[PDB]
């Protein structure tokens, strides 16, 4: 009923760049391993608790932000359903403690080993204590991205990763068919340990502001070639097939003999007898068909992508001859390569430009054929195991193999043209605290740029929107750096683009109402105008320092306070009348940034769209909350996400003549949602959500709803405990439509109710008095908001109805305390309507946890340590279950 306070520790998380997800494109083997060796942990370093866990994660929302979050403070592995973890005894996912048993029940103690296994195509995660299995598994994830094997800790921990593949092998034998976790390294990239979703790094000069990162997804390792089914290869192109195939095969043989390859029966170059030294009419058929169809598909895509070939000449092709070779090409059996001359012609630079396109297509085709055959990528080559370290489609390869493919396809194009045949997402807006605004003075701060890209530095009013682009409105005067643009309601060119490592100043004179910028060591000038680049901006209500960071970038904003360490304010600055922004400040300035966590906030009055008007009930009408679009003339339509403002806990954790004998002893509530005419019922989802819901999707449907199940079984089955969990339970309005309605615009109203049983946690739905078939079971002590998500297609969209049915209490009966026995609807002002705000402000903590990551060696694995505590005074809002 009132706000509560406590002391909570800080939590972090570290993952290796071993992204292991898969959708359909050989992105992973399917069965993967994980080893963690915990040497020592100090229980209750500070006097709250000690936190140490291992588990998996997902690159689809797992962003544990230090400080607040969900629940009472810390949010490590075991947060919202994107992550799954397992401590010594329990096993949590989605912020609920599921106790599971294991031999020698104990918390994660010093000198222990924890094993984890991930299995796909039958989604599952299996844990193992040292020498014994665990009695609990997962079965029903919603795989959409790659998985990080992560660990979480509070303070005073000593853990080592044991991914394997080196002299520091696993402490236990993996189950058969499981990868040894040393693969999936994504070549052209090393194996490092990094924190997840960082926004503040410790650089040589101190703090570095870090923008959002960029990582691949599940639909990125799939080899996607060009559509090559219907192009109709002409017989004129069919006549070259064999000659081109023979040329490329003999050049392949030349490249192989460059390593000394000879003709024999067996591979293993130590023997040096791999059979590859025959002409195109003498290879074994299994390779013959593949080689001839490889040349065929090269020509096939050549015709497909365009560049219509033409009959340049034929006498040159007829008179083209072979080339002499030295004695190093003659080999023991007697084969000699026959390289056709290639210096006779040279390709257009456009031809060289698209030389790499068909190389990309050929490598994609190779990957597609290999995955169809049944091979998967591995860091270590293993032909008998059908593993090859070259199955990344094109873009994650290494430059050596890329250049080899370019050389092969370039020589193929050389040969073809020799015979004539002429060929024709979010951003972060860092900002100083609102208490540091200054309305009159002369100040200057020095921004530093390390990586070139999209960044913006300047001044903004205190009431700055954290979602709109910086400078796109009248509340911020900012300066871009990628192209030198003044960015106050426009993109007029101003100055020159910066470089890497230089600084850019930001200088304000509110007495004369001007903002002047400066580059590295000099004051820049506009295209034609003089200095004072903003021409008498209004004072308003002061100004604040603001920095903008793009995707994959870092920054080094310097708000004074270290005038000795400033790289400038001597060449310029102090000669004029100016002072550093934080010259006299013992405490370093704390900053507020933009967080990409979609939170629920009340609808704002006078909103351009989504007008909400509360309506009082009548004798025949219950009280209603309605949503009305106010600008359906030309405005945009977006998938709104709304819920009610108050919770509804499920208790017991341990005509229409209402009869008081039963209505006073029932635990059922009915509230219904009515749709309006014109709005398509197929675009309305009505149901319930939990406080740990954060999904925000433009293509949201019932399929993409977070859902994870846990089966706390035993060795001999014992599937008694097979409960599931989710943060969104609802039904789709498209299933509540008669089969004769599709094909025309509906003109009636469909009302969908919501029936729950607080006594037993049973849920069911009804539509227009007809019982449905879907139902959900919820664990006790669960808060379930009344929620509805709709994509509007009418001026009037939805209308809440806190109605009361026969012998069923209305929502207001359990919405509050004093109305526990009142069989009448009520709509107190607290029960407002809120929508899903995409982003919201947050406070950067003054300090941060100091975690040391290093490679202990080739035997002990990778070392992660932390030896100092850190506490924060939490303020837990109780009805939202967030602090």
């Amino acid at each position: 009923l009132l706000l509560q306070t406590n002391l909570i520790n800080y939590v972090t998380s570290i993952r290796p760049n071993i992204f292991v997800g898969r959708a359909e494109g050989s992105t992973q083997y399917g069965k993967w391993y994980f080893e963690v060796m915990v040497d020592e942990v100090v229980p209750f370093l500070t006097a709250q608790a000690t936190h140490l866990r291992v588990g998996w994660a997902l690159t689809e929302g797992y962003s544990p932000y230090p400080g607040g979050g969900e629940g009472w403070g810390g949010n490590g592995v075991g947060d919202d359903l994107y992550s799954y973890g397992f401590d010594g005894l329990h096993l949590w996912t989605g912020h609920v403690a599921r106790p599971v048993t294991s031999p020698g029940q104990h918390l994660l103690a010093p000198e222990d080993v924890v094993s984890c296994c991930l299995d796909l195509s039958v989604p599952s995660i299996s844990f193992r204590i040292n020498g014994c299995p665990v009695q609990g598994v997962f079965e029903a994830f919603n795989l959409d991205g790659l998985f990080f094997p992560v660990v979480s800790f509070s303070a005073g921990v000593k853990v080592r990763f044991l991914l394997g593949g080196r002299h520091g092998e696993f402490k236990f034998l993996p189950p058969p068919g499981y990868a040894p976790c040393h693969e999936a390294v994504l070549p052209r990239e090393r194996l490092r340990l990094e924190p997840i979703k960082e926004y503040r790094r410790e650089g040589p000069r101190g703090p570095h502001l870090v923008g959002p990162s960029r990582c691949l997804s599940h639909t990125d390792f799939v080899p996607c070639p060009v559509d090559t089914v219907q192009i109709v290869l002409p017989p004129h192109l069919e006549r070259i097939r064999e000659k081109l195939a023979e040329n490329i095969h003999e050049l392949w043989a030349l490249t192989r003999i460059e390593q000394g390859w000879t003709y024999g029966p067996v591979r293993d170059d130590n023997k040096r007898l791999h059979p590859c030294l025959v002409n195109f009419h003498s290879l074994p058929e299994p390779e013959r068909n593949y080689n001839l169809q490889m040349s065929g598909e090269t020509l096939k895509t050549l015709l497909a992508l365009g560049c219509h070939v033409g009959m340049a000449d034929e006498k040159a092709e007829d008179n083209l001859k072979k080339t002499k070779l030295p004695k190093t090409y003659m080999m023991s059996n007697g084969y000699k390569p026959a390289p056709l001359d290639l210096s006779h012609v040279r390709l257009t630079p456009a031809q060289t430009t698209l030389v790499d396109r068909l190389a990309e297509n050929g490598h994609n085709v190779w990957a597609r054929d290999r995955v169809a055959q049944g091979w998967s990528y591995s860091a270590v080559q293993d032909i008998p195991a059908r593993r090859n370290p070259r199955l990344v489609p094109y873009r994650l390869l290494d430059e050596a193999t890329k250049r080899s493919n370019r050389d092969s396809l370039c020589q193929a194009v050389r040969t073809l043209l020799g015979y004539g045949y002429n060929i024709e997402d979010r951003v972060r807006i860092f900002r100083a605290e609102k208490s540091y605004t200054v309305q009159s003075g002369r100040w200057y701060f020095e921004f530093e740029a390390v990586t070139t890209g999209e960044m913006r530095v300047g001044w903004a009013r205190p009431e700055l929107r954290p979602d709109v682009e910086l400078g796109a409105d009248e509340l911020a005067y900012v300066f871009n750096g990628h192209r030198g643009q003044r960015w106050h309601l426009g993109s007029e060119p101003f100055g020159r683009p910066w470089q890497s490592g230089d600084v850019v100043g930001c200088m304000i004179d509110l007495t004369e109402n001007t903002i002047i910028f400066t580059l590295n060591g000099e004051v820049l000038m506009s295209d034609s105008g003089s200095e004072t680049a903003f021409r008498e901006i209004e004072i308003g209500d002061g100004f604040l320092p603001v920095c903008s960071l793009g995707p994959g970038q870092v920054g080094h904003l310097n708000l004074g306070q270290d005038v000795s360490s400033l790289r400038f304010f001597a060449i310029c600055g102090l000669q004029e009348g100016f002072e550093p922004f934080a010259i006299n400040m013992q405490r370093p300035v704390t900053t507020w940034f933009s967080k990409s966590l979609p939170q629920f906030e009340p609808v704002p009055p006078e909103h351009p769209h989504y007008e909400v008007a509360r309506m009082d009930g009548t004798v025949d009408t219950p009280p209603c909350l309605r949503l009305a679009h106010r600008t359906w003339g030309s405005q945009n339509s977006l998938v709104e996400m709304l819920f009610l403002r108050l919770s509804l806990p499920v208790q017991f954790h341990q005509d229409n003549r209402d009869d008081p004998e039963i209505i006073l002893n029932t635990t059922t509530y009915y509230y219904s949602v009515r749709v309006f005419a014109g709005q398509e019922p197929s675009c309305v989802w009505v149901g319930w959500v939990t406080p740990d819901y954060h999904q925000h999707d433009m293509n949201f449907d019932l399929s993409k709803v977070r859902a994870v199940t846990v089966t706390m079984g035993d060795e001999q089955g014992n599937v008694h405990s097979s409960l599931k969990c989710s943060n969104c339970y609802m039904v789709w309005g498209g299933d509540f439509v008669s089969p004769g309605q599709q094909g025309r615009i509906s003109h009636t109203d469909l009302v969908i109710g919501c029936l729950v049983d607080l006594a037993t946690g049973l849920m069911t739905f009804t539509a227009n008095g007809k019982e449905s078939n879907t139902f959900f079971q919820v664990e006790p002590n669960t808060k379930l908001f009344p929620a509805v998500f709709v994509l509007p297609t009418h001026q009037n969209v939805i209308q809440f109805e806190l109605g009361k049915q026969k012998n069923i209490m209305p929502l207001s009966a359990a919405m509050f305390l004093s109305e526990r026995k009142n069989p009448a609807p009520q709509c107190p002002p607290r029960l407002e309507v809120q929508m899903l705000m995409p982003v919201s402000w947050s406070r950067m903590p003054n300090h941060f946890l100091q975690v040391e990551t290093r490679r202990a060696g080739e035997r002990l694995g990778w070392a992660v340590q932390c030896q100092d505590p850190l506490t924060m005074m939490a303020l837990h809002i109780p009805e939202e279950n967030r602090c």
């Binding site: 509560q4 209750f44 006097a47 709250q48 020698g104 104990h106």
Partner: protein, 107 residues
């Protein structure tokens, strides 16, 4: 009566026989995860006494079924507890209590 589930192995053959004053460190939280009492905030052990209860009897037997280094997660039912009246202003009536008792046995 009470639940004697363990969180740490500890050592076994240090049971409190009778009379001796045992030393425990307790963190007490209500249902729903809400916490009301924790001696770790004051950094002072409770210095539990046996026989002359002056405490909740459920907590008494929960601590009795413990030994050195054996952290116990007690699940005291609202029968051997503050009862149907509860502690006014702190513990609402008729609620289970969760305890995190760790015995140090400084005697």
């Amino acid at each position: 009566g009470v639940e004697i589930e363990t969180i740490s192995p500890g050592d076994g053959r240090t049971f409190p026989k009778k009379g001796q004053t045992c030393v425990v460190h307790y963190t007490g939280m209500l249902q729903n995860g809400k916490k009301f009492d924790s001696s770790r905030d004051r950094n002072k052990p409770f210095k539990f006494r046996i026989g002359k209860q002056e405490v909740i009897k459920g907590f008494e037997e929960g601590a009795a079924q413990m030994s050195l280094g054996q952290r116990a997660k007690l699940t005291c039912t609202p029968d051997v507890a503050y009862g149907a009246t509860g502690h006014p202003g702190v513990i609402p009536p008729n609620a289970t209590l969760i305890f995190d008792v760790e015995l140090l046995n400084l005697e």
